[PDB]
Each structure stands twice: as structure tokens, then as C-alpha cells.
């Protein structure tokens, strides 16, 4: 799709958990817990004039704490402890593995964040490496920055009295790797994302769910920056990019037509309720009140498929769905939906709409339908301008969906509590000359030097047990058996624990096949 011609500029931001014994600026363990919180702490973050009454109300948070799994650090009741060395070491290694240039002195900062996921109103982050690069068929891609930050608390519930986060994840080490913001080749983006992943898997990193997080930033000339969050599957990056390029192009064509016919967006909301006194659609008939708005010249464009399956109206529907509401009804799709033309003509008439423009109605309770229509007008206005910068999420297919605006520029100042960390070049080399082998290397090396088949070696690496590992037996017991135990047991007891002992007692009394039962007891 002539990428370099539409001016496609992509970027990648990868966050990775570390799997260190202790958290970053505190000593608590790096694992989450399902246990019931020992203490719920009520707090309120603070801004910076008629809203300093509504804004505040949206900053009331409840923090779940644990007498064991949490400390005063997570609660903002005790200053952060000094930078966790183990973390910085992995961070550095990773950086070096990316050909980055590790900093001479590490300085912790406070990225302003009144989101609630942070108990202090900020996130502690620090820059560790810079100007790095990778190698891809498509060419050499530069890696801009490498930062070590605390992961945020996690959300648990939302109630009248605001959001409720849990502090267990708060503090777990993280590395934010950003790449050049102007990629240009979809296939290249997937290559970088993949290589980065394989590098991260080359160091002490958490493996599992929440673990990694990848956010791509697609862009197009005369289009707009849009962040796509949570793209679990890398194989699908090409696809979601291409599909995004289409959506911005479609949205652009729609911009040019709205201008072709000098469309206008009137924030005038009409109480088109009497028009449905006797209607044939339960949805509305059972709806409290019902309002509608006109979009001049917008006809025929709210239903145009901008992306395989979704239409502009869908975008509007998504913009409007916030503030509550099922799904907006509109001219280009309303001839149906259990409503006859005599009715369709009734709306156009009551709203005073020409045959060239269209109407978007909302059947709900007046108080909100008003707030909802105000949004479909906001987006309507944006369509006149074109593609709007927003944070979307990826769907099962390659499409995406609106979530919220784009992140504001990250305001951040000094975290005076934590000392500076000088990275003595001496210890920096004791690493750069001992970087870890990639997974691929691990597999072949381990194969080549133990007779392990590709399969057994593949699994042993996949499960991170290569370090533990008749050879073909000791492996077939951690790559095969131990997985079978995650179905009838709690093998998460101690690798090297019972294993040490039992593995010995296989040299004397205890047939190969006894293993998958002996250790089990433990």
C-alpha cells in the first residue's frame, strides 16, 4: 500500500516487568496476590475553578494494602528506598544488548501521573540507556531510550466512591523501550518488536500474562498520531497497521467530502420525542426521553465503512458511548432497525434537516442523552478536520477502537528522595563482555552439547528451565513431566529443592519412571 507514499510513520513502546527478588524502590516481593487486602486506605490526589469541585471528586481512591505483601513505601507512608541494584543490572544488560549507550549517572524522576495507579501522584522513572539500534532486513532501526520505572498499582473495582487499586503490582521493575517514531515499513515494525522480545527473554524477565506490554503508534501524512494499546500478538502487527492506514485514509476522504459540501455541525439538540409517541421499536418506546442532532451535509458519510466492518458512525457511537448509552441511531443506518420510512421522514422533518445532511439520535434518559449527543457533535466536528489523535485498542481482527484521547505531554520533575546511582564503567564491562545468549542460541547450544532434540530443547527454553537441566531424561522431566504436574499438583515448590535430592537418588534405587511420582509427593 505504498507506505512511504502515504507518509506512514510508526513507533514502538515496549514495557517489560523484571522478575527481581525485591521491587524497585522497596523490598517487597515482585508477585501479585489474590488474598484479601489487610487494609483499605482512602485517599485523594490533588490537581495543580468551577471544576475544583468536580475534578477533585474524580480523584478519590481506595488503596488495598497487605501487612506482608506491602510496606509503607507502596502506601506513600515511607520514603522510597534506594535504587534496586538487581533491577538496574538487568536494565543495563538489556540496554547493552540493544547496543545502547548506558548513562554515566542514573537519576530517578517523577513522571506526573494523577491517574490513581500511583499512590503518590507520580511514577518514579529514570533513564538508563540511549541511542541504541537494531538490525532488520528492512534496514537498521534506532532504539531511542531505555528507562527503569515502577509498574503501577492495578485496578480492582469501580464504585460510587471511586476506583479501587491494589498495591501488589505497584513497584515491580519495568523497562520502557522506545524506538524511532518514524519506521515506515509494517513488516519492519514486527521485526523490531520480535527481536526486542527475544532480547528481553535473554535476561531475568517476568514471563506470563501482565508481564509484557506493547503499544504501537501509527501515523500518516495529513492523517494523525494514534496510539494502539495492547497488541499481544506480534504476527498481527502488519495487519493492524495496514487496517489503520485504511481507517485514516477513509476518514480523510470523508474530510474532503465534508468540505466539498461545506458541512456544518450545529450543537443544537432537539427533543425529538413526540415524533415517536407511537413507535414500533421497544428500544425507544421504553426509553426515558429522546434527543437528536443534525449534521449538515453529513449524509451518506456516517455509514461509510472506513475500516473493514466499522464505520464513522461507529467511531461516533464509541465517542458517544462514554457518558453511558447503548448505541446511537443514525440516518445512514436508520432506514431499518425496526423503524419505518414514515418515521424516518418524521425525524428528518422535526429536526429540520435537508436531504443532503443526516441525523444522529439517542434514545435514553434526557440528562445523559444530552451529554452523549454533545459528544457525537464533538466527533462530528472532528470529521470536518479529519483524523483526530487518540488512544485506541486492538480488536480480535486487525481493527481498533476508540478508548480515550492521547496522553498529554509528560510533565516530570526530580525525585529527591532517592540518591543518584553512578554506573562505574568497570562493572559495566563485566557485563558488556558477558551479555546473555538469545533464546535461539540457548536452544542450539543446549542441543549441540547435550544431544537434546530440537523439540525437547525448544520446550526446555520455552519454560525457562535450561538453567536447571541420561540428559534426555533430566530434560524430559522438566520439559514434559513438570508440565503434567501443573494439572495434578503444586510443583511450584522449589526448583533445585526436592529436585536436587531426588535427582541424586536416580543413581541408586529409583527407576527413571519413578520420578514423576517421587518429587510429586513434595
Amino acid at each position: 500500500m505504498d507506505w512511504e507514499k502515504v507518509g506512514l510513520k510508526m513507533g514502538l513502546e515496549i514495557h517489560q516487568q523484571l522478575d527481581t527478588e525485591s521491587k524497585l524502590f522497596c523490598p517487597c516481593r515482585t508477585e501479585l496476590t489474590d488474598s484479601e487486602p489487610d487494609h483499605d486506605i482512602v485517599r485523594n490526589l490533588r490537581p495543580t475553578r468551577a471544576a475544583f469541585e468536580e475534578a477533585m471528586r474524580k480523584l478519590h481512591f481506595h488503596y488495598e494494602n497487605y501487612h506482608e505483601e506491602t510496606c509503607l513505601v507502596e502506601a506513600d507512608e515511607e520514603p522510597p528506598h534506594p535504587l534496586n541494584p538487581e533491577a538496574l543490572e538487568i536494565a543495563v544488560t538489556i540496554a547493552l544488548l540493544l547496543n545502547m549507550r548506558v548513562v554515566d549517572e542514573f537519576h530517578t524522576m517523577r513522571k506526573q501521573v494523577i491517574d490513581g495507579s500511583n499512590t503518590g501522584g507520580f511514577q518514579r522513572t529514570g533513564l538508563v540507556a540511549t541511542d541504541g539500534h537494531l538490525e532488520t532486513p528492512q534496514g537498521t532501526v534506532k532504539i531511542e531510550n531505555l528507562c527503569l520505572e515502577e509498574d503501577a498499582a492495578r485496578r480492582i473495582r469501580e464504585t460510587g466512591d471511586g476506583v479501587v487499586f491494589r498495591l501488589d503490582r505497584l513497584g515491580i521493575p519495568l523497562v520502557e523501550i522506545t524506538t524511532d517514531p518514524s519506521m515506515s515499513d509494517p513488516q519492519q515494525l514486527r521485526e523490531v518488536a520480535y527481536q526486542i522480545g527475544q532480547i528481553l527473554r535473554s535476561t531475568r524477565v517476568k514471563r506470563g500474562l501482565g508481564t509484557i506490554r506493547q503499544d504501537l503508534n501509527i501515523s500518516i501524512r495529513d492523517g494523525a498520531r494514534v496510539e494502539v494499546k495492547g497488541v499481544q500478538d506480534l504476527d498481527l502487527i502488519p495487519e493492524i497497521v495496514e487496517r489503520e492506514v485504511k481507517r485514516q485514509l477513509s476518514l480523510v476522504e470523508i474530510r474532503d467530502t465534508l468540505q466539498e459540501r461545506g458541512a456544518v455541525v450545529e450543537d443544537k439538540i432537539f427533543d425529538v420525542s413526540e415524533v415517536f409517541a407511537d413507535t414500533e421499536s421497544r428500544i425507544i418506546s421504553s426509553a426515558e426521553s429522546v434527543l437528536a442532532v443534525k449534521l449538515r451535509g453529513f449524509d451518506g458519510l456516517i455509514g461509510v465503512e472506513i475500516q473493514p466492518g466499522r464505520r464513522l458512525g461507529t467511531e461516533m457511537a464509541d465517542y458517544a458511548k462514554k457518558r453511558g448509552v447503548s448505541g446511537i441511531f443514525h440516518t445512514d443506518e436508520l432506514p431499518a432497525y425496526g423503524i419505518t420510512e414514515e418515521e424516518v421522514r418524521g425525524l428528518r422533518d422535526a429536526v429540520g434537516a435537508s436531504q443532503g445532511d443526516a441525523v444522529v439520535m439517542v434514545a435514553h434518559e434526557r440528562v445523559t442523552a444530552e451529554n452523549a449527543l454533545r459528544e457525537v457533535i464533538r466527533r462530528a466536528e472532528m470529521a470536518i478536520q479529519g483524523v483526530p489523535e487518540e488512544t485506541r485498542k486492538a480488536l480480535p481482527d486487525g481493527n481498533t477502537q476508540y478508548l480515550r484521547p492521547l496522553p498529554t505531554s509528560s510533565r516530570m520533575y526530580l525525585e529527591t528522595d532517592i540518591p543518584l546511582f553512578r554506573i562505574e564503567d568497570d562493572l559495566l564491562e563485566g557485563i558488556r563482555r558477558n551479555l546473555p545468549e538469545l533464546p535461539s542460541e540457548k536452544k542450539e547450544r543446549i542441543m549441540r552439547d547435550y544431544g537434546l532434540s530440537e523439540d525437547l530443547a525448544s520446550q526446555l527454553v520455552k519454560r525457562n528451565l535450561v538453567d536447571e537441566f541420561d540428559t534426555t531424561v533430566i530434560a524430559s522431566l522438566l520439559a514434559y513431566t513438570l508440565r503434567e504436574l501443573r494439572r495434578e499438583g503444586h510443583d511450584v515448590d522449589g526448583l533445585g529443592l526436592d529436585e536436587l535430592r531426588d535427582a541424586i537418588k536416580l543413581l541408586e534405587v529409583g527407576k527413571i519412571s519413578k520420578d514423576a511420582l517421587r518429587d510429586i509427593v513434595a
Partner: protein, 424 residues
């Protein structure tokens, strides 16, 4: 405040803080603003603030700067009158996100900018008398504050809030209790969490102190969070508060008493029902204090010499922080007696904090009494210290000082000890 090699390296290119510079290394090349470097830190490194927002430290041993741009230096009545005095405590502020540096802010305006809620509580007046870190505070400044509060309160103020630092806050409140007599409330406050933080407890602490400064409780008090939650504040009687934790928002607890009240930016709850009402007293100011007072914590091994060196140094009084019930090693007797022969008052308090001293129960105690020691009932040690300073500034008659120490004057002594005064 760079030093050595750094400054030398940074000067030789005529570069100062704020200056956008470009540093080149054999394998790197940064571009950012130069930031002042903490003195604690040692040279060889230059702090730069990269475009992305992060501060970095770069080794100059083999650098090379180039300036790219020089720095840049851009009353409704019907509501009570409350003065917000800052002694050095910062309960509100503003940050310059272009330096990363946080800057205080104690103005009737600034405070309002940060705590609008105030406008419905009272009419703010907030100058900044002076400024000393709570840690570096001394007797001299107790007075200086008592004098400062006396003013505001004399110039027509329905209440006065003193923005003090946490560390010593209780000592100070003690002082103000003995040196001030008031018709209006005087509430000390501060924050455990820097005010620049969005989580800072400064906000609730201030507009709850302001709220209290309105109340009918006219005594010198301390108002801080009552828990780790941002919901209430406890109004603590001045001569019965003590910072019991090094970091928790709820560090201040009432010791040999219970919180006098429970404040909110909306109202008070007055739990204690026996206190100095509003008008009832008339503004007097006993600003006389004897800067010289020993305050010696007893402990196993302590030497009489320490006590002696104090008498020799012309110390007018000694406040010993003994072992449970009001004790201290027998080897100290001679010295403590000697102090008496020298007309130097010696009072006893317990390290336990929670409790009432009774030097009558055991022999060690009785002999200590025999040597002229003054039991201080259930007065918190630091208060007994603060008091001696005041009392010995009110007279030089040993005998009288001993009388005034035992004399309950502001609430430092409580005749009886309730089961409710020792939760855990």
C-alpha cells in the same frame, strides 16, 4: 553549587545552570539544560536535563561542551479572620517543571490557589514570619514564634495557624503553651509528605487547621491526620502531643490524654469536653525563656560526669529522662545532690513516655527524691524540658522553679490516668 573538576570543566566554557548545552563524548553526545548539582554529590559529573524530560549525569573527564542558548529568568465578611503563619513549615507550594526544582509558597494567595476550599472557611491572612527547618529549631525561636503569634492575634485574628515543621513541632507547641495565654485558637500544622506531592497531607492538614482555628478551643494545639486516610484530623492539645513515627501521615498522637477533637474542613467534633473556651482568656505573652537547660536521657552506663560537666558549664537546670516510673542509676545520686547544693533544679520524667512517674514506690526513687529530684507526674519528657526552659526564665529561685514545674499550667500534667490512654 558544582565543585572541583566539574565547575572547572563547566567554567572553562563559560557555562552556567539553565544554559542549553551540547556535550560530546567518544561514544555519546547529549543535548540538554544544565541543572544545579547537590553539594553532597561530588564532581566529575554534570547534570543535564534531556529533551525527553529526564535528568542525566554525564562524566566530563572526556567531554566537550558548547553553549547553545543562555539561561532565562522569566474578603467577604461574615467569615472569621484567620492568620496562617509560616515558621519554616511549607504546607503548600508550586513546581517549576522546567528545572525540576520545587519552590515553597506561603502567601494568602498562593495558599488559596492550592487550597480554594479555604474561601468558605475563613478570611486568610498568611505572611511568613521566618524560616527554620524543624530540626534546626531552638529555644530562641520558640519565643520568636510566640512573639509572632502574639502579633497576629493582637492585630485582630480569630485564630492563628502556625505552619511548623514536623520533627520538633511538638516541642514548639509546648513552648507556645506556656508562653502564650489566648482568647483565640493557635493551631500548629505541617505535612509529613512534601507539599509539592499530589499526595501530600498538607492540604487536609491546612484546611482542617484553618477549620480548627475557628473552633471554640482556645489553646495552643497541633492538628494533623488522625489516620493514614485523607478523611479526618485530630486536634491535639499542645502540651500532650508527640511525633510518634518517622514517616506516617498519622505520626502525631496525643500521649497522656486523648485527642481534644476531630476536625474536617467542614467542622469540629470536640471529643474532649473540658478545655479553655474562646473569649475566656486574655492575650498575655511570657516570652522569657532560659536557653540553657540540660535534657539528659538516662540509660545503662551513663556517667555522673555528663551530669557534672553540665553543672560546671553553668547549666541552670536539668531534666532527666529516666527509666520507667522515674528512675536513674544510683551512681548519679551524688551528682544530682550536688546539683541541688548548687541551686540547680533537677526534674525526672520517664523514657516510657506513656505513664505517671512515682518516685515513692521504690528505694532508688526515694533516695533520688531524697537528693532533691522533682517528679513531674505524667508530663512528657520533651515538655518537662520545654517547661524548665520557660520556668527558669520566669525566676531564679530554685524552690519556686520546683513549685512551678509541678504546677499544672497549660495541661502538661493530668491528675489521673485513664485506661483509655494506652491502646497499644
Amino acid at each position: 553549587s558544582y565543585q572541583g573538576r566539574a565547575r572547572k570543566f563547566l567554567e572553562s566554557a563559560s557555562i552556567d545552570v539553565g544554559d542549553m548545552v551540547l556535550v560530546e563524548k567518544p561514544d555519546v553526545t547529549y543535548e540538554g539544560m544544565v541543572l544545579d548539582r547537590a553539594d553532597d554529590a561530588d564532581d566529575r559529573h554534570i547534570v543535564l536535563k534531556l529533551e525527553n524530560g529526564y535528568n542525566i549525569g554525564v562524566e566530563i573527564s572526556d567531554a566537550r561542551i558548547e553553549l547553545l542558548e543562555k539561561g532565562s529568568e522569566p474578603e467577604d465578611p461574615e467569615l472569621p479572620d484567620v492568620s496562617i503563619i509560616s515558621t519554616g513549615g511549607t504546607v503548600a507550594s508550586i513546581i517549576d517543571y522546567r528545572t525540576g526544582a520545587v519552590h515553597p509558597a506561603f502567601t494568602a494567595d498562593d495558599l488559596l490557589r492550592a487550597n480554594p476550599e479555604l474561601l468558605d472557611i475563613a478570611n486568610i491572612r498568611g505572611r511568613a514570619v521566618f524560616n527554620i527547618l524543624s530540626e534546626n529549631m531552638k529555644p530562641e525561636y520558640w519565643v520568636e514564634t510566640a512573639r509572632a503569634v502574639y502579633g497576629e492575634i493582637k492585630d485582630g485574628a480569630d485564630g492563628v495557624v502556625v505552619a511548623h515543621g514536623t520533627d520538633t513541632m511538638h516541642y514548639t507547641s509546648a513552648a507556645l503553651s506556656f508562653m502564650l495565654r489566648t482568647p483565640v485558637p493557635v493551631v500548629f500544622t505541617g505535612a509529613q509528605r512534601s507539599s509539592d506531592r499530589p499526595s501530600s497531607d498538607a492540604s487536609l492538614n491546612i484546611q482542617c487547621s484553618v477549620r480548627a482555628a475557628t473552633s471554640e478551643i482556645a489553646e495552643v494545639t497541633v492538628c494533623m491526620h488522625a489516620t493514614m486516610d485523607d478523611l479526618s484530623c485530630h486536634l491535639h492539645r499542645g502540651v500532650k502531643v508527640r511525633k510518634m513515627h518517622t514517616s506516617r501521615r498519622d505520626t502525631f498522637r496525643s500521649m497522656n490524654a486523648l485527642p481534644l477533637a476531630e476536625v474536617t474542613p467542614d467542622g469540629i467534633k470536640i471529643l474532649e469536653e473540658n478545655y479553655r473556651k474562646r473569649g475566656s482568656d486574655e492575650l498575655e505573652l511570657s516570652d522569657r525563656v532560659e536557653e540553657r537547660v540540660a535534657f539528659i536521657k538516662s540509660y545503662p552506663g551513663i556517667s555522673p560526669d555528663i551530669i557534672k560537666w553540665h553543672l560546671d558549664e553553668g547549666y541552670r537546670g536539668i531534666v532527666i529522662e529516666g527509666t520507667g516510673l522515674g528512675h536513674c542509676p544510683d551512681t548519679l545520686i551524688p551528682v544530682i545532690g550536688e546539683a541541688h547544693d548548687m541551686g540547680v533544679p533537677v526534674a525526672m520524667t520517664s523514657q516510657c513516655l506513656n505513664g505517671r512517674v512515682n518516685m515513692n514506690v521504690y528505694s532508688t526513687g526515694r533516695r533520688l527524691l531524697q537528693a532533691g529530684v522533682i517528679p513531674c507526674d505524667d508530663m512528657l519528657p520533651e515538655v518537662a524540658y520545654v517547661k524548665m526552659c520557660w520556668v527558669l526564665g520566669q525566676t531564679d529561685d530554685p524552690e519556686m522553679a520546683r513549685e512551678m514545674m509541678r504546677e499544672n499550667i497549660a495541661g502538661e500534667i493530668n491528675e489521673r490516668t485513664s485506661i483509655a490512654y494506652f491502646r497499644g
